[PDB]
Amino acid sequence: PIVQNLQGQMVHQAISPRTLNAWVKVVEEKAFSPEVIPMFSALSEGATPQDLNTMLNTVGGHQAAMQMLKETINEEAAEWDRLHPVHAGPIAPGQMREPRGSDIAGTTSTLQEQIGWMTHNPPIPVGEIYKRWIILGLNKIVRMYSP
Amino acid sequence: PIVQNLQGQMVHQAISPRTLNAWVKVVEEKAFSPEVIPMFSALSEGATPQDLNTMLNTVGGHQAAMQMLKETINEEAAEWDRLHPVHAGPIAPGQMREPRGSDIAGTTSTLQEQIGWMTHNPPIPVGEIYKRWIILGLNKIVRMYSP
Amino acid sequence: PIVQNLQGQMVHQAISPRTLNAWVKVVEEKAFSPEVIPMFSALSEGATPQDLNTMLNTVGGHQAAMQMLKETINEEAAEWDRLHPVHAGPIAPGQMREPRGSDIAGTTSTLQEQIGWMTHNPPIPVGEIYKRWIILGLNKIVRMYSP
Amino acid sequence: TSILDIRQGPKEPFRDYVDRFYKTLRAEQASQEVKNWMTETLLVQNANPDCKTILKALGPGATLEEMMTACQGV
Amino acid sequence: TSILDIRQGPKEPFRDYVDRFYKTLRAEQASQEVKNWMTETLLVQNANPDCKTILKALGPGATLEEMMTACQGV
Amino acid sequence: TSILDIRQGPKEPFRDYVDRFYKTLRAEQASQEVKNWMTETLLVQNANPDCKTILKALGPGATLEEMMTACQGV
């Protein structure tokens, strides 16, 4: 995640193993139950896309759901690209590039790039955009997996 | 691992016992399952070759796989030496030596040497080179150990 | 152990209880298994002789092995004294004394003395000399305790 | 076990089968385009006659929630 | 137990035997060259007749994934 | 399971039923006004005859502690 250091700057720090394991354990115990979404939200505080793929990729089991989510993440990403067209002409030397759906999904962007966008002024909340897609896709799952 | 200190420099700090034990426990529980690879990747963040041999050497069980991996690590190392020949003439007093496959595998290099290469400017990512060999060798294992 | 402080000096800090307990638990669970040796090696990082006797003295059980090790430690120590004779004439006021087998085993030396030798310039690696004796004696045990 | 060996039982819910499929698909490392081909093809092909019949009625263009709710009573 | 005492059962999968071999090989401390000699030699020699037969057909130059997939049905 | 499928047993305490209701209501995502409509309507409707009778006597305007204490002996 990207956290504030004592000095008063935003720097990246790694997520903790008993945080990781707590994510694992939630999924083990409460599967598709709604409490998973606030839980997720708390444990995703200050998290990167990269950390969010890590969390999704580290799941075991419920592979039908994991595939449905993936496909929701790509749909929501396809929709990001649709709604926000690429911008006019070449990229400025003085500036950094606008993200695509795949940069938001973490796929085409690097960590330093993910830190550029979030730490820069104005900052862009690529975590929160992926977060809604995750929560939206979580609703899809919850609604389906209701019996 | 080699971590950034508060002062703003990169210094070595030892890996934690409940990190060690978490590595052990993953292997105990999920054996050759694919979730082992992102898991590995997270727990190998900022890690040295030396720490990576420590993690491999501390395995118990699955010795056929452990041998297959070793032999993959040496093959990938042999390939490093092949692709990157040694450089022209004697080593400069002002400079430090280029690594071989065995320095990447941690074998012929010392810790201070591993810290020289990574902390120096430009830095060389000998962790990430070993990491790909580990991940590649992990694919070999996963593919074989599929039933 | 003797660790580097934030200020940039080497100072002694005590070993942690859940480190101690992790040493205990390893021995409980894996007895004479080979994984004990890398495990030992990691948990002995930056350790003193004094801390190494603490670890050996805190064992319960496997007393035949513990005696075989002791006797190996004394043999290896007797051998240190043999190979390295005492030096010519009286000890200089400006200098500190050379170690014997029993100083390496921690027995005849004090902590401040163990810190003098290791922190001083050149430093002498009395941990690493005891460490080989421990590892050598660990091989003896492992080879015997194979069935 | 190979991906071709993944098949739906005569009494096995589709759901339990689809889980098995994306687990084994999870251990395939092929290009995405090939894995898309496997998805639309092999899944239905090794599906049981009763559900297979059902899935033929969904036509093409169908998505996983609709397939999964379509073969629920079977 | 000594490395010479490691042998494959008449019904034991090779796989379970190869695991036993590199565990015991893991408690041998000999030079690498000697341990290479042990690998190519002793492993096949104490392998069971049915797999032994199989391994003779792989010829020399063979690697562990190919040996391990070669004696799988045995 | 759908919200319409939530019903009170003939021997089931209302209390255990009301818990089931706001759990399933907790998995409905509808506008608040619709969820208010569901509250006053469906809860009583799928309540058992003995308690249903009781709840009819509370009249309208009733709140959950009073409903919950009203059907306690039933």
CSV table of C-alpha atoms in Angstrom, one decimal, chain D residues 1 5 12-13 15 19 25-26 33 38 40-41 43 45 51 54 57 63 65 70:
chain,number,residue,atom,x,y,z
D,1,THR,CA,-5.3,-34.4,-14.7
D,5,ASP,CA,-10.5,-35.2,-18.9
D,12,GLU,CA,-23.4,-33.8,-10.8
D,13,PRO,CA,-24.6,-30.2,-10.7
D,15,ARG,CA,-22.1,-25.6,-10.8
D,19,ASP,CA,-15.7,-24.8,-10.5
D,25,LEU,CA,-8.2,-23.8,-16.6
D,26,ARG,CA,-6.4,-21.9,-13.6
D,33,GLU,CA,-7.5,-16.4,-27.1
D,38,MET,CA,-11.6,-23.6,-24.5
D,40,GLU,CA,-16.9,-21.6,-25.3
D,41,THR,CA,-16.1,-25.0,-26.6
D,43,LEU,CA,-17.3,-26.6,-21.2
D,45,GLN,CA,-19.2,-30.3,-24.9
D,51,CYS,CA,-27.9,-29.6,-19.2
D,54,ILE,CA,-30.5,-26.6,-21.8
D,57,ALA,CA,-31.4,-23.3,-25.9
D,63,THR,CA,-22.7,-15.3,-19.9
D,65,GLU,CA,-24.5,-16.1,-14.4
D,70,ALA,CA,-30.0,-21.8,-16.5
